[PDB]
Amino acid sequence: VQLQQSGAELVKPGASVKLSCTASGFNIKDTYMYWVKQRPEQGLEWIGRIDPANGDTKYDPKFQGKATITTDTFSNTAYLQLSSLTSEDTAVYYCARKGLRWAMDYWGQGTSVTVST
Amino acid sequence: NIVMTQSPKSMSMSVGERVTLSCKASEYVGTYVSWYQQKPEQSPKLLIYGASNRYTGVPDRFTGSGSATDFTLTIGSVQAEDLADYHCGQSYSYPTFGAGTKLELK
Amino acid sequence: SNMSLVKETVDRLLKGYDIRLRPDFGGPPVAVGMNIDIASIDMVSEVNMDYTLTMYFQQAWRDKRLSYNVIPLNLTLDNRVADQLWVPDTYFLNDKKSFVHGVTVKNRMIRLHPDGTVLYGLRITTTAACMMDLRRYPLDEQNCTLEIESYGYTTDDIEFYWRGDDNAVTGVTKIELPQFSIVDYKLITKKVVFSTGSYPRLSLSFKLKRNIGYFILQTYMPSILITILSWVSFWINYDASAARVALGITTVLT
Amino acid sequence: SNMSLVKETVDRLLKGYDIRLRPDFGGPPVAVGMNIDIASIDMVSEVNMDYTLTMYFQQAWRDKRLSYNVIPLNLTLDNRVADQLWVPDTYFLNDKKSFVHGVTVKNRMIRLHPDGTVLYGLRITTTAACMMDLRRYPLDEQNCTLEIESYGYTTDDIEFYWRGDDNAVTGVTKIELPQFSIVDYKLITKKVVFSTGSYPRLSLSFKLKRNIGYFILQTYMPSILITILSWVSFWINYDASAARVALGITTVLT
Amino acid sequence: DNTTVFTRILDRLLDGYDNRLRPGLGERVTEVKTDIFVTSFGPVSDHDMEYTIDVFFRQSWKDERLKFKGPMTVLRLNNLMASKIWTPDTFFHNGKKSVAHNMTMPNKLLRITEDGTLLYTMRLTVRAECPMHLEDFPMDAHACPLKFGSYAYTRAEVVYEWTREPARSVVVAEDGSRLNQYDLLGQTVDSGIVQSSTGEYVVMTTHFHLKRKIGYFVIQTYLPCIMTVILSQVSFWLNRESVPARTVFGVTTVLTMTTLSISARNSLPKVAYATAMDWFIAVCYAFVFSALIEFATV
Amino acid sequence: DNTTVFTRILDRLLDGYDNRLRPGLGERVTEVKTDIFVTSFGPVSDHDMEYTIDVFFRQSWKDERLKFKGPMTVLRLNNLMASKIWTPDTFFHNGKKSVAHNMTMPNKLLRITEDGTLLYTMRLTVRAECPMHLEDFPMDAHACPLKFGSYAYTRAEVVYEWTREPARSVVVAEDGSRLNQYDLLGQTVDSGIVQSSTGEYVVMTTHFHLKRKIGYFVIQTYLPCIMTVILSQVSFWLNRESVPARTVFGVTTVLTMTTLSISARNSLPKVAYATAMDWFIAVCYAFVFSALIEFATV
Amino acid sequence: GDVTVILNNLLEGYDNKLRPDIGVKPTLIHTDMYVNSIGPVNAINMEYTIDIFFAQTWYDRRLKFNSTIKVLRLNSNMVGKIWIPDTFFRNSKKADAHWITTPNRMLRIWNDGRVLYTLRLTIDAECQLQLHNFPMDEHSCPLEFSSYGYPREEIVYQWKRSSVEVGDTRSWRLYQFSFVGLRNTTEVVKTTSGDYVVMSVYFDLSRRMGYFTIQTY
Ligand SMILES: *[C@@H]1O[C@H](CO)[C@@H](O[C@@H]2O[C@H](CO)[C@@H](O[C@@H]3O[C@H](CO[C@H]4O[C@H](CO[C@H]5O[C@H](CO)[C@@H](O)[C@H](O)[C@@H]5O)[C@@H](O)[C@H](O[C@H]5O[C@H](CO)[C@@H](O)[C@H](O)[C@@H]5O)[C@@H]4O)[C@@H](O)[C@H](O[C@H]4O[C@H](CO)[C@@H](O)[C@H](O)[C@@H]4O[C@H]4O[C@H](CO)[C@@H](O)[C@H](O)[C@@H]4O[C@H]4O[C@H](CO)[C@@H](O)[C@H](O)[C@@H]4O)[C@@H]3O)[C@H](O)[C@H]2NC(C)=O)[C@H](O)[C@H]1NC(C)=O
Ligand SMILES: *[C@@H]1O[C@H](CO)[C@@H](O[C@@H]2O[C@H](CO)[C@@H](O[C@@H]3O[C@H](CO)[C@@H](O)[C@H](O)[C@H]3NC(C)=O)[C@H](O)[C@H]2NC(C)=O)[C@H](O)[C@H]1NC(C)=O
Ligand SMILES: *[C@@H]1O[C@H](CO)[C@@H](O[C@@H]2O[C@H](CO)[C@@H](O[C@@H]3O[C@H](CO)[C@@H](O)[C@H](O)[C@@H]3O)[C@H](O)[C@H]2NC(C)=O)[C@H](O)[C@H]1NC(C)=O
Ligand SMILES: *[C@@H]1O[C@H](CO)[C@@H](O[C@@H]2O[C@H](CO)[C@@H](O[C@@H]3O[C@H](CO)[C@@H](O)[C@H](O)[C@@H]3O)[C@H](O)[C@H]2NC(C)=O)[C@H](O)[C@H]1NC(C)=O
Ligand SMILES: *[C@@H]1O[C@H](CO)[C@@H](O[C@@H]2O[C@H](CO)[C@@H](O)[C@H](O)[C@H]2NC(C)=O)[C@H](O)[C@H]1NC(C)=O
Ligand SMILES: Nc1nnc(-c2cccc(Cl)c2Cl)c(N)n1
Ligand SMILES: *[C@@H]1O[C@H](CO)[C@@H](O)[C@H](O)[C@H]1NC(C)=O
Ligand SMILES: *[C@@H]1O[C@H](CO)[C@@H](O)[C@H](O)[C@H]1NC(C)=O
């Protein structure tokens, strides 16, 4: 029905950052949850996916190890945590659920991570 | 990893004319290619679930073509709100997206 | 109305009924009239020594319990009522495997007349065993029989007969087997005695005769042809020993 | 006296018996011991890649609900109680067509004990699938199995074990086949994993070496005798060409 | 109200009856009196080592719970009552595929005598295993058995017996000989005990003694074979000058031996050892080949 | 007697339950998550244009009526409750004759999670028609489908979906290949809609891609046929004076071409068009006949 | 819910033994059939296999209701619980419905009491083939059906205009033959039990010549 996320964040390089994506109007266990990033004026890039009912997780072969996805079945929340970040991954991070024919019908509001000194 | 090739990278067209887009699949994807609109400073919005099926709330002018690998999105009379970034993405495998297509008025 | 009337009549009739006990359990034997409409005969097998016969097997007796007078018509009830009414345990002694066809429902009839007569039709395809002398093969006429008999009830509890005399069986003239031809059929009523008691039996029989028009031009002409082909050696001179011996031994080989 | 007693024992028991739930539903898994007494291995077939066999499949577990402390004896109840008792959902993965024998009644056993043990026997015949590597045919030893597994219940609900260890399987050493010879057999316990969960597995397998001598006389004797009669062509003088050509081409066509 | 007394009698009969407890479960044994009447002895298959038989299998036992007293001494009942009443779980030990015919109704009978005796006779075709030693083929004689006991009821619980004398219990009908290739010489009953993993059981054995008819393999194989050895022996009466004649004679003799041997090999069944017909065809070929090599030496 | 709580829970769940109405009848559309696990891909009967396959046909949906609160979070159940609750009536669109294996008990599995999710799996052997285009026989390839969907429930009422990613949904076991003629190259799922007089229906298609193995047909037809063409050809090295040898070689050659031709043609299904093997046999036979008539005019 | 209440009201006082209008009038039954395929037409047994979605619909005043829903769509669970006509195929050597994963049957009930029962069948129908002029021969042979027990006065059958519907006709297993058309007839047949309305559907099957050229000529 509607996916809310946390606000924009300003962090230094080499640190760790944790994004939230809370779901309302439905229950996360019945559908997959996805995390997608979009760079400023480039196309969408898929990070990974988490099965909240089982906890199984899969990652893009260029996001393995860097990005980790977890879930909280109480809060209807999907968490993205990234370990160590360089000075290129400053992009809007979207949270989405699978729709009817495995399409991302409902998306989050977008969270722009920003990097500087 | 399925890679989606979307064409043309940018275009410009006048109001009220046919416009056709294209998304090409390296491997087979049956009917699981979804199209998403993204206005500037807005989240993506799904138009076409699967191959050639309109989503709720979408106008009737939008329509897509389905096949094994060749996927096209066509629009009829184009109004002035269609200036936005249109992306294609598969779901037969782990999901991947194309480069996108940017629509401009001129 | 008519619908409610038929409703209460059928509900009255089936209430207090005992499938276990035949009509007139302590009384005389029950007369069961029998008709058979033969739809198809096929697969008259020489190697397996049987034949597949499809028929609309039909029976007719009287149950005084299933008697009504309020409604003047014949009640063709749905075939699922046959579970809840007594029917005689007629079986075919010489069947090897049989089945009632079950499309779209069980092909079965229950019809109750106002006088108490029941009419219980069924569609059976039966692989009846028909033992065949082949001593005179292929100019042989065969006698296949269908021995119809009740299993449980003795001749003092049930009684069979052919309903309508020689009109009890129909459709024999329309049957066209591939090899044979139905020349004659007979209907026989008699009793058989086993260790457990005496029972009634009705026997339906067919005298199949075989058509020889194939068997001549397939089997008999090549043998006579090879015999003449062997006979031609005598007109060959004795000098051509190789030709004569080759022709003769080729006749032996073929 | 001792009937009114056994009757009330079987009735208080089956009263309030919940077929839907296994023994110790929220408790530890229920152990089930197996025994097989093989009656025959009917036909090992290579055109279809299967083998038909018959066995007395027995299972033994411990249901605490079926406990009685009044009558001191074991009770062989009639086999129609078994549909009112929890029996494990044992299936054979590699069967193609299987049946429990249904003559004179359903060939199935049910037997209770005072401690709560049950013994559930079945005379089953399965057409198990055996893929055979015919690369070294006919001097080859094939290895055909029967994989016993739980369908609905995971390995945290039912444990399988062989009742009697290597003595669990009996009657292997009295099966004579026209084409193979049972060299040995092995009883393997295993745990398989699928998407829905882990489940117990037991395996019964047979090493079927192929009996020799028949195949010698059927093919290797004809092959050698054709090649031997081929070599009299050179003993035949080269002047006579037609006889040599006929001899050689007769070898080739044969 | 003609049948109401009989309905009352049967409802009183089954009131409190449990079909799950054998008559005498905690006191006595159950003595079952068995009888068979073979309406047809079906064809015997030697490739499969099996045979078919159609019988009226008969049983009888005493159940004290089913005593009655009324206007009749025997309640001949329909087949569906047998489900409602305890019956023994007889089965055929060497049965491969047995079918109980139920056309048009279940071919079963039940007779309850007031003293409580039962007689539950059934119609059923049985396909049973007959292990054969086909060494004397086609001059072999088999005693194909028909064993049966009881599933799950040990000798301490159910014991079987014949109702009449054992020599006059398995009765074969006058025209039940559906054998086309075998000749039935006689029946032979026997009774005994087996042991299985569950316990000891009463087994009631029957044996049907068969002798194969040798009247077809004479004309199919032996007469053509013998006539061809004689034809091979005609070569010794020919002069040596007709070398094409004698060699075509010889090669045709070996070739027709190959054809008759492969023809007879499918006639005789799948088997792992040498039979009499195989020895005969081997000797006849050996004589033909010896005639061939003798032609070669001369 | 700790099971009293669970039987109370089950009786509460089935009290007032109506298995005749789909879940969420007047509220939403029933979403059925389907899965298939091929335990063994059966042999492809080329003669009948069908193929056999053994699958653990797995499904899942959500019934809100079957929620519970108990000590255990997943109820693993005896599989006879599946008859007592709603299950979707999935059927195979191209299924010829399939069987749900009932050995020893019904090979069925029912699990009810705390939230009301269901997981109804069944084992069965599907026999589905595979329409083949045998123009390129035996160098041909086929995509044999497996289409299934709901009977009597339209797209607005029952919609099917894959449980996992569609590339990873229909999974084949490692040793589960009973094929001997073909080889299994890959799987291909697809979800679509079929329009009909009664309405729209969801259809999930699965294609199995097969390539025939040429190894046996090289030995059976092509190598004997090439050798026979060479056997025609060595006639021409033979001389013109020995006419009987050359003509008997030719007539024997066309004889073996005829028997090889009908032997090759018996193996294939009867089809109404000429295949590649048929063209090979026809051309090579034309060469045999051309050699014979060239010898004749010589 | 309310659909359960509607059904419990409908089946109350319902006999599945008495057809509708049992002593008032015959029950008109309209029939349609979509042909999923026609299997091989072999002349050795004089038979052909067919695969169809048989459909029947009639009027039954007992299953009449007043509510806001207009069509109730149900499984095969009620196909035993309501009156179904006893249709059977008079020239069927063998025939069975489909039962995997559930009995392939449909039932739908309208506001006016109309019913639509529909099921999937494979029918192994017999037909004689006059094998003269072979293999330039044409055959057009039926799939007959009627009610078993109910005479003309109790069940009367009839065709819809768009009754029979063939499919792609390219996946069909008519190897020797080519489908050229179909036609539907109706007539009354005399039977010993009474008169019966018979419907026939002739599938025109001209044999296609040219295979037997390479085979035999
Ligand atoms: C001689 O002996 C032989 C052997 O003893 C006899 O052959 C037997 O004959 C009987 C009666 O004809 C058959 O019983 C019926 O079978 C059909 C289904 O048949 C198909 O499936 C069989 C396998 O069973 C599968 O389906 C059942 C479904 O219940 C399931 O339980 C089972 O696990 C399995 O999945 C096949 O064996 C069968 O093939 C054979 O039978 C065909 C019969 O027509 C024949 O044509 C074939 O050639 C072949 O021989 C076939 O593929 C069942 O549907 C039917 O059960 C319904 O009807 C009875 C009676 O009314 C009722 O008690 C049941 O409860 C059930 O009714 C429910 O379901 C209906 C579904 O249509 C529904 O309409 C009802 O309203 C009712 O719904 C209620 O209950 C359900 C739960 O059931 C519930 O969910 C609902 O909400 C609602 O409350 C019978 O079981 C035997 O199958 C057959 N056996 C064999 C081996 O052939 C032969 O008849 C004898 N001959 C003579 C002359 O005596
Ligand atoms: C596959 O195996 C199943 C279990 O192993 C069989 O399920 C059995 O089907 C029988 C057929 O109806 C049931 O019999 C019924 O039992 C009840 C008990 O209370 C009686 O009321 C019924 O009258 C009786 N049926 C009849 C016609 O009298 C068994 O109860 C039932 N057992 C279980 C445990 O479910 C399947 O039938 C079998 N399917 C096949 C072989 O196709
Ligand atoms: C095919 O074989 C059957 C099998 O026997 C033949 O049936 C036989 O038919 C004759 C002629 O009716 C019966 O003779 C009758 O015997 C009674 C005895 O009381 C007598 O009263 C009659 O006057 C008549 O002579 C004979 O009994 C009967 N066989 C048996 C075993 O009952 C049949 O005739 C043969 N032919 C055909 C065309 O079916
Ligand atoms: C028939 O085929 C089966 C299938 O391959 C053979 O069974 C396998 O036999 C081996 C050796 O006997 C088993 O190895 C065992 O592995 C366990 C694993 O923990 C180990 O602990 C044991 O010590 C032993 O090494 C293997 O498990 C078993 N099963 C398989 C592979 O599924 C069998 O040997 C073949 N022959 C016969 C006559 O059965
Ligand atoms: C199938 O049966 C229907 C019903 O009889 C036929 O429909 C008729 O078609 C003709 C024209 O061909 C019209 O004149 C009639 O009025 C129609 N009847 C009805 C009741 O609508 C239909 O033609 C038949 N189809 C075939 C091929 O025989
Ligand atoms: N006319 C018509 N009728 N029915 C169908 C149809 C509907 C659902 C499922 C299937 Cl298997 C089919 Cl064939 C169709 N495709 N076309
Ligand atoms: C009922 O059937 C009998 C016999 O066929 C017939 O004589 C009678 O007229 C029928 N009843 C009616 C009302 O037609
Ligand atoms: C019941 O059977 C067991 C196992 O065969 C045996 O040990 C026990 O003695 C039997 N019960 C009685 C009371 O004999």
Can you describe what's shown?
- By secondary structure, chain C is α+β, with helices and mostly antiparallel strands.
- Chain C is built from 3 helices and 12 strands.
- In chain C, strands 1, 2, 3, 5, 6, 7, 9 and 10 form an 8-stranded mixed sheet that branches. A 4-stranded antiparallel sheet of chain C has the order 4-8-12-11, with no helix packed on it.
- Chain E has 298 residues and is α+β, with helices and mostly antiparallel strands.
- Chain E has 2 domains: 212 residues, Neurotransmitter-gated ion-channel ligand-binding domain (Acetylcholine Binding Protein, Chain: A); 85 residues, Methane Monooxygenase Hydroxylase, Chain G, domain 1 (Up-down Bundle).
- Chain E is built from 5 helices and 15 strands.
- Chain G has 2 helices and 12 strands.
- Chain G has one domain.
- Chain G is mainly beta.
- Chain G is elongated.
- In chain G, strand 1 and strand 2 form a beta hairpin.
- Chains D and E meet through helix 1, strand 1, strand 2, strand 5 and strand 6 of D and strand 5, strand 6, strand 9, helix 4 and helix 5 of E.
- Bound molecules: a molecule of 9 linked components (NAG-NAG-BMA-MAN-MAN-MAN-MAN-MAN-...), a molecule of 3 linked components (NAG-NAG-NAG), a molecule of 3 linked components (NAG-NAG-BMA) (2 copies), a molecule of 2 linked components (NAG-NAG), (6M)-6-(2,3-dichlorophenyl)-1,2,4-triazine-3,5-diamine and 2-acetamido-2-deoxy-beta-D-glucopyranose (2 copies).
- A molecule of 3 linked components (NAG-NAG-NAG) binds next to loops of chain F.
- The site of a molecule of 3 linked components (NAG-NAG-BMA) has 8 residues of chain C, from strand 8, strand 11 and strand 12.
- The PDB classes it as membrane protein.
Distance between the termini of chain B: 37 Å
Beta-strand residue fraction of chain B = 35-45%
Radius of gyration of chain G: 20 Å
Bound ligands, each once: a molecule of 9 linked components (NAG-NAG-BMA-MAN-MAN-MAN-MAN-MAN-...), a molecule of 3 linked components (NAG-NAG-NAG), a molecule of 3 linked components (NAG-NAG-BMA), a molecule of 2 linked components (NAG-NAG), (6M)-6-(2,3-dichlorophenyl)-1,2,4-triazine-3,5-diamine, 2-acetamido-2-deoxy-beta-D-glucopyranose
Structural class determined from secondary elements of chain B: mainly beta
Q: Number of DSSP helices of chain G?
A: 2
Query: Quick one: CATH superfamily of chain B?
Result: Immunoglobulins
Total count of domains of chain B: 1
Share of helix of chain B, binned? under 10%
Question: Assembly type of the shown chains?
Answer: part of a larger assembly
Largest sheet of chain G: 7 strands, mixed
User: What is the percentage of strand-forming residues of chain G?
Assistant: over 45%
Secondary-structure-based class of chain G equals mainly beta
Note the run of SSEs of chain G as H and E.
Answer: HEEEEEEEEEEEEH
Largest interface in this structure: D-E, 60 and 52 residues
Number of DSSP helices of chain B?
Answer: 0
- What is the general shape of chain G? elongated
**Can you identify the CATH class of chain B?**
Mainly Beta
CATH architecture term of chain B: Sandwich
Number of strands of chain B: 11
